[PDB]
């Protein structure tokens, strides 16, 4: 329980601001003014907060939690910018891999389960047809994805191992995650219980804390892009829409169900759209369906900016209160986008049971560990029509991907 949040204060508060916030809060919950249930405990909690924050010795080591996060991120930025300025190129060759099964299809190409012929290790190969990517006008999107993936490092991101290109295709070889997409397990289970949803949500929250500190917007949160690893922890895949953005950006991209209002509207937007999408993800995960569905995307768009959300009656009230603050059409009022940023979400009642450090360390017991039947089993993935892999004799689109 954050003491600064208890006294309603800025981490930087003066000692007089602490002594005045303490008198202001204790009045509101003093039993002389408040017999209602829980005022006894909130009065006790306001007492503890003033006792810690006004002793400079207790305040210094309580402040170490935020100082630790600050240092971790400062170092994570230094390591990212190193790889950002010198990205890895041409770190393998197609003939080094045995092609096994298609793991999914797209307008760009496909994803193939493959095996390294020397180490026998298994990998997910994203194959991208150069001509298509030109045809789909997704050239920058494909250079971004490779560039960002090779530079990030965080427990809940997929890991890019090698990348390279031939005369016809782009290749991105990432570590294989056998549990498959969250989408599959969610459609089949129906919905997760709130503690089950909170488990995944907390991982997404920490991952966005990391990405936003690098100035990265993710822009494609949805259950399809969340892989489940053997210990039941999330791996975020698909960075085709991710962009390094210091200020505003303007593109209409992503999945209709998950789009913040200001992406749909012509005005510009910032990384707050990722927190709106987190709201949509928690909703879908706990309800079994998204908060905004309809058959035409413009109908989805109308419901999105409409400002109205219906919650299932099994939604706990803390959960609805978190959701009301994330699915907030007014971005000057949306959680994650305020003075205290991500800590407004981490300090929220719905997360009170969350051990953020244990989650990051992956020490929390997972509520679901997918059916492990071998280091190269594909049961947790759907079945797609195979197709053979063609490579021209003449190099296609040399200039447009010379960077890759």
């Amino acid at each position: 329980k954050d003491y600064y949040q208890t006294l309603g204060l800025a981490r930087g508060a003066s000692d007089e601001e602490i002594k005045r916030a303490y008198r202001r809060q204790a009045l509101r919950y003093h039993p002389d003014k408040n017999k209602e249930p829980g005022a006894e405990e909130k009065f006790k909690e306001i007492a503890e907060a003033y006792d810690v924050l006004s002793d400079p010795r207790k305040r210094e080591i309580f402040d170490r939690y935020g100082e630790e996060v600050k240092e971790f991120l400062a170092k994570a930025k230094e390591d990212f910018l190193k790889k950002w300025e010198s990205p890895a190129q041409n770190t393998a060759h197609l003939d080094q891999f045995e092609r096994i099964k298609t793991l999914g299809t797209g307008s760009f190409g496909r994803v193939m389960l493959v095996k390294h012929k020397e180490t026998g290790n298994h990998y997910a190969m994203k194959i991208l047809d150069k001509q298509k990517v030109v045809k789909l006008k997704q050239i920058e999107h494909t250079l971004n994805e490779k560039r960002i993936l090779q530079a990030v490092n965080f427990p809940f991101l997929v890991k890019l191992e090698f990348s390279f290109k031939d005369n016809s295709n782009l290749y991105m070889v990432m570590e294989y995650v056998p549990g498959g997409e969250m989408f599959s397990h969610l459609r089949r289970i129906g919905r997760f219980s709130e503690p089950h949803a909170r488990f995944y949500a907390a991982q997404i929250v920490l991952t966005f804390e990391y990405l936003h500190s690098l100035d990265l917007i993710y822009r494609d949160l949805k259950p399809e892009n969340l892989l489940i690893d053997q210990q039941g922890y999330i791996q975020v895949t698909d960075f085709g829409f991710a962009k390094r953005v210091k200020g505003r950006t303007w593109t209409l991209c992503g999945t209709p169900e998950y789009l913040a209002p200001e992406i749909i509207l012509s005005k510009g937007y910032n990384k707050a759209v990722d927190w709106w999408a987190l709201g949509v993800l928690i909703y879908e995960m706990a309800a079994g369906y998204p908060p905004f569905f309809a058959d035409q995307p413009i109908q989805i768009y109308e419901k999105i900016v409409s400002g109205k959300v219906r919650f299932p009656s099994h939604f706990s009230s803390d959960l609805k209160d978190l959701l009301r603050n994330l699915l907030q059409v007014d971005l000057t009022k949306r959680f994650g986008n305020l003075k205290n940023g991500v800590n407004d979400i981490k300090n929220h009642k719905w997360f009170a049971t969350t051990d953020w450090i244990a989650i990051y360390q992956r020490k929390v017991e997972a509520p679901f560990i997918p059916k492990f039947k071998g280091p190269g089993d594909t049961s947790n993935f759907d079945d797609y029509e195979e197709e053979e892999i063609r490579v021209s004799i003449n190099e296609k689109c040399g200039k447009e991907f010379s960077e890759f």
């Binding site: 997704q138 209409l252 209709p256």
Partner: peptide, 20 residues
């Protein structure tokens, strides 16, 4: 429920993105 109206629809499958 809305969950019944959901499986009564077709947006139950994997959602494709829009790149515009």
């Amino acid at each position: 429920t809305t969950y019944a109206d959901f499986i009564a629809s077709g947006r139950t499958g994997r959602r494709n993105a829009i790149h515009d």
